[PDB]
Design a protein around this nucleic acid. Structure first.
Lengths: 96, 126, 234, 205
RNA sequence: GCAUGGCUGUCGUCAGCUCGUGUCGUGAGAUGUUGGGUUAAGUCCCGUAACGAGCGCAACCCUUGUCCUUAGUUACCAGC
């Protein structure tokens, strides 16, 4: 299982929404593993007509997060996907 | 047992240092110590905390170091072995706090800032 | 009290010097013995008894009497023979603008009514950051717990030291019970006491008369608190 | 000069107005939808004052929560505007569209709702200060702890660019812990262009 | 761009800039905000016709440096 979102106050708060709501149904799912983080810097110029040394630089992040089942016997999380997706979490399934 | 685990980081390096009783076995990344560090003064700097605590002949030393620069890995071992020597007791604690070996060197590189060219150098005006 | 040996033994007669001097006071002087001015002994006690007459006249009339004159040397008798339910007092320097800027002081007593109770809780240095300010507010606003109205009796123990309160009194029209000396001027004060402020005995024997005359005023007010409702002895 | 009071606190105080993840091949094909939605909706809802238009993207369609302080004007006789726009938001945004409407109880404590009224008053030829001394005290009988309102522009004069500045209460701006609203709505008079800035300060933490 | 909004440079990341009520002055003003000590700092302490409040400075945020807990694939190899 792999998860992609934009802020750690969603994506690392929806794993407990999956770990609790799958281990309850009997199957063993281990602890989630972090991945390296995408970081993209964007330095943009700020003045309309030119004054070059005034700048401003941003950064867009992307948090990744990987789950790991042990015994696949539950289609419970397959129906509870619209619940576990909330606003900006994308879940590609790797049911190991 | 008597295996002792020692880590140490200096200038974005990282060295696994294992320490156990032996007879002068100094091996790093499956290489000899004189062979690994080619023609530098830091061949003796890795021995400087060892010969200070008069244990140069009494241990096996197994070192695995990753990353960093050439003479930055040699500093990682020197900080790394001092943490491995103080797993025993605090008898050699005062022999190394006074020696200035235990403190990790915090001096890391500084980022380029806009307007400037280097970290602090700026172009010439008139 | 009215006794003469209270006046003789306390050290009332002596003045400051002969060059520290004011001829607006010089009507009430007796001599210049050994280059130190001797105040008059015979015009003091008729003035002094009639001052306590109007203290007692106010004290049974449900009002306030204010004790001032904060010197750290000899003002502790003002700290001591006060602090009861009918008389406020002061402990530190008189604040510039109190009777005239009383609207501000109503806002600054709001902090005083909390930081005693706020020290129930007591981070670590953050408790000391607010319990430090409780000492200064106790040093100045501590003697006044009354709020509302203005004090109808200002008892000034030293006129030369505090011209601030006399000016702010006469802008509002409240009686000022001053104790002048040789060098200080007898203007601005209402009921004069031509006395002295150079001994611990004289500053005490002026004030045992004042706090006793308000107890009998409160004893007179307790005599008259039944007169307010019942009319048979009223 | 005074970096924008949302762009320094996205994080510790406020959050985005639109949350959706997108791949690097479709990221710039959802932005151009969501930026000509907001130019569309405010030009239709010029009355029935609108403060915030949030957009979520659930699985494969949409969700929109339009906020008005007067929902009865928009939902008029059971959604005669709601289903009429929901037909026609799909024509700009090919997914099926949800439309949801909440209330903005205490309308005098959000900066967009306040600053739209300033443009209304200053285009009725109301005095530049009698409009605004009353538009701050009304927003101080209930609610906020500090308000700044700057009114800059032509201000009726010949060649005059003065700035009215009136403040009440406490407004910090170098504290990231605080909670500040901000809005700039403009005004087109019969001469000149007047811009209005609002800095409603709600409670801190 | 000297009809203006918006957005940026500059003095200068320099330590200042103002108000309420009060008193002094015929008035424009002034006092608070000066004095002694001290601070990167109008930062603090003691003083004091002023008592307070705001903007600022500080802290709140990010990152780097130490350790602890939760986590082990695609990362990791001390033991096997």
């Amino acid at each position: 299982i792999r998860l992609k979102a934009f802020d750690h106050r969603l994506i690392d708060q929806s794993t407990q929404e999956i770990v609790e709501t799958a281990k309850r149904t009997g199957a063993q799912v281990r602890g989630p593993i972090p991945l390296p983080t995408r970081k993209e810097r964007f330095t943009v110029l700020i003045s309309p007509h030119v004054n070059k040394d005034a700048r401003d630089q941003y950064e867009i992040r992307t948090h990744k997060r990987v789950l790991d089942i042990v015994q696949p016997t539950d289609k419970t999380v397959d129906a509870l996907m619209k619940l576990d997706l909330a606003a900006g979490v994308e879940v590609q399934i790797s049911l190991g | 047992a008597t295996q002792n685990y020692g880590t140490g980081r200096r200038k974005t390096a990282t060295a696994r240092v294992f320490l156990r009783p032996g007879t002068g076995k100094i091996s790093i990344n499956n290489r000899g110590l004189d062979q690994f560090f080619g023609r530098e003064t830091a061949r003796m700097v890795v021995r400087q905390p060892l010969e200070l605590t008069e244990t140069v002949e009494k241990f096996d030393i197994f070192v695995t170091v990753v990353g960093g620069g050439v003479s930055g890995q040699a500093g990682a071992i020197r900080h790394g072995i001092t943490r491995a020597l103080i797993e025993y007791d605090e008898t050699l604690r005062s022999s190394l706090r006074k020696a200035g070996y235990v403190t990790r060197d915090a001096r890391e590189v500084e980022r380029k800032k806009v307007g400037l060219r280097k970290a602090r150098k700026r172009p010439q005006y008139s | 009290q009215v006794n003469m040996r209270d006046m003789l033994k306390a050290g009332v007669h002596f003045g400051h010097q002969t060059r520290y001097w004011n001829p607006k006071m010089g009507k009430f002087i007796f001599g210049a013995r050994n280059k130190i001015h001797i105040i008059n002994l015979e015009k003091t006690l008729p003035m002094f008894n009639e001052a306590l007459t109007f203290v007692e006249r106010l004290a049974a009339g449900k009002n306030k009497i204010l004790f001032v004159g904060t010197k750290r040397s000899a003002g502790k008798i003002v700290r001591e023979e006060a602090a009861r339910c009918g008389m406020p007092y002061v402990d530190h320097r008189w604040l510039g603008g109190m009777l005239t800027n009383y609207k501000t002081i109503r806002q600054s007593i709001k902090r005083l009514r909390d930081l005693e109770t706020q020290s129930q809780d007591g981070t670590k240095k953050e408790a000391l950051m607010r319990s430090r300010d409780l000492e200064k507010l106790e040093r100045s606003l501590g003697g006044i717990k009354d709020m509302g109205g203005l004090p109808d009796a200002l008892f000034v123990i030293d006129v030369d030291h505090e011209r601030i309160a006399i000016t702010e009194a006469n802008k509002l029209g409240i009686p000022v019970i001053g104790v002048v000396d040789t060098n200080s001027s007898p203007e601005g004060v209402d009921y004069v006491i031509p006395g002295n402020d150079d001994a611990i005995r004289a500053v005490q024997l002026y004030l045992n008369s004042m706090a006793e005359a308000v107890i009998r005023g409160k004893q007179g007010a307790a005599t008259s608190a039944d007169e307010f409702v019942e009319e048979a002895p009223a | 000069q005074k970096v924008h009071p949302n762009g320094i606190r996205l994080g510790i105080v406020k959050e985005h107005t639109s949350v959706w993840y997108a791949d690097r091949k479709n990221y710039a094909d959802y932005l151009f939808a969501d930026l000509k939605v907001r130019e569309y909706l405010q030009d239709k809802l010029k009355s029935a004052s609108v403060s915030r238009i949030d957009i979520h993207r659930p699985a494969q369609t949409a969700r929109i929560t339009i906020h008005t302080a007067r929902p009865g004007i928009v939902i008029g006789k059971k959604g005669e505007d709601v289903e009429k726009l929901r037909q026609d938001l799909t024509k700009q945004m090919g997914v099926p569209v949800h439309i949801n409407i909440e209330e903005i109880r205490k309308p005098e404590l959000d900066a967009m709702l306040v600053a739209q009224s300033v443009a209304q008053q200053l285009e009725r030829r109301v005095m530049f200060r009698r409009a605004m001394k009353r538009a701050v005290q009304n927003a101080m009988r209930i609610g906020a702890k500090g308000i700044k309102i700057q009114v800059s522009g032509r201000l009726g004069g010949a060649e005059i660019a003065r700035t009215e500045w009136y403040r009440e209460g406490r407004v910090p701006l170098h504290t990231l812990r605080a909670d500040i609203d901000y809005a700039t709505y403009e005004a087109h008079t019969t001469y000149g262009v007047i811009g209005v800035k609002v800095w409603i300060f709600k409670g801190e933490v």
